[PDB]
């Protein structure tokens, strides 16, 4: 064979294509989405590792566990399947080939037990999987000819399993309750009064009673899940909220990344009048945001192929790897 030097490339079209494993003790720290495979590598000193090949066609759905032990990835082609890799050994632990046309979204639960792979638009067969075995848990029929942008799960649990939420391509936002009792999923559409924005990235709060969805309209739509309703919207940043991730401080804060490369802090319990402090700047159009390790660094991924490390106390910019589109 031939020795391989540093490999670069990330798919800037899809949201959240660069995310960091929260445990940095291993040789892998960062995961980025290419066309046919993924790249697992380290953050600081560029010594790349194995590209987990094994997909027949182009990748269009990415997820990783909050514990950092599992990764999940789908593909768009005719032989559509979603596969879950392990990170301890570079091997596909799970394969699921039941979606016909393409994968829409893939997400993990708050704990590493549950998978949501509501992924099609022709047949639209919503799946909820478990990580103990490679078998189905919940089954649903979504909608003919509807696209799902992003989905997430709540940290609020009852009887050991969580409840998820997903955004359609249009206005609607569906909340799903999944149970271990019989595997019957219950869905409800949120009562959007007049807020009809295209949802870019959603994530629940710490308590789980609220979910924040940053939209293309540069505002965060807040949804209370006990009433299944929209409460308020707050405009953050001078660009649409490409990435949204809850702040690690412990309060009601949430880090967001705008279309103009501004990483700002959004407080849930705040006044109607807000002042948009930029809170440092990123040169590229930020689409992905993650927390790298215990050092307090946020890894931000841009649509221009740039990955940047931004530490806290103090705030410095350090570009990592660029890539042409």
């Amino acid at each position: 064979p031939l020795v391989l030097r540093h490999i670069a490339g990330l798919n800037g079209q899809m949201f959240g294509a660069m995310r960091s494993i929260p445990n940095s003790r291993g040789p892998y720290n960062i995961a980025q989405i290419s066309g046919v495979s993924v790249i697992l590598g380290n953050e600081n000193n560029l010594a790349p590792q194995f590209t987990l090949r094994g997909h027949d066609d182009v990748i269009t759905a990415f997820a990783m566990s909050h514990g950092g032990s599992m990764l999940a990835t789908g593909q768009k082609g005719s032989n559509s399947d979603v596969i879950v890799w392990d990170v301890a050994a570079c091997a596909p632990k799970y394969k699921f080939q039941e979606h016909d046309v393409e994968v829409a979204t893939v997400s993990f639960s708050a704990d590493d037990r549950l998978l949501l792979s509501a992924s099609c638009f022709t047949d639209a067969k919503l799946y909820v999987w478990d990580m103990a075995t490679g078998k189905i848990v919940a089954k649903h029929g979504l909608e003919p000819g509807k696209r799902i942008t992003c989905s997430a799960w709540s940290p609020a649990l009852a009887n050991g399993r969580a409840y998820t939420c997903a955004t359609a391509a249009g206005e609607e936002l569906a909340l799903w309750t999944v149970d271990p009792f019989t595997g019957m999923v219950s869905g409800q559409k949120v009562v959007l009064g007049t807020v009809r924005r295209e949802y870019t990235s959603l994530a629940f709060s710490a308590d789980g009673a609220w979910l924040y969805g940053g939209t293309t309209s540069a505002d965060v739509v807040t949804v209370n899940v006990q009433r299944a309703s929209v409460q308020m919207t707050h405009p953050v940043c001078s660009g649409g909220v490409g990435a949204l991730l809850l702040s690690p401080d412990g309060g009601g804060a949430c880090l967001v990344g705008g279309r103009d490369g501004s990483l700002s802090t959004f407080n849930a319990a705040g006044g109607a009048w807000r002042e948009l402090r930029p809170f440092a700047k990123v040169p590229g159009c930020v689409t992905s945001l993650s927390l790298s390790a215990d050092g307090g660094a946020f890894l931000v991924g841009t649509a221009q192929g740039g990955v940047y490390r931004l530490d806290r106390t103090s705030l410095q910019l350090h570009t990592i790897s660029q890539a042409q589109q």
């Binding site: 009064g193 007049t194 505002d219 309703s229 919207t233 707050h234 009048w273 807000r274």
Partner: protein, 51 residues
């Protein structure tokens, strides 16, 4: 005489008048499937007066 705080200064928008801060923003709110609308401390009188 006894000094008392002026009650009219509680408005957040009045904390810096006659300053050009373009990054100040306005929030909105939704009331259980009702019409989403601008959030002010007294927006009703600004909208449709009274009487």
């Amino acid at each position: 005489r006894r000094q008392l705080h002026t009650p009219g200064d509680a408005d957040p928008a009045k904390e810096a008048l006659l300053t050009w801060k373009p990054e100040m923003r306005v929030g909105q709110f939704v009331k259980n499937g009702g019409l989403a609308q601008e959030n002010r401390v007294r927006g009703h009188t600004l909208r449709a007066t009274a009487g």
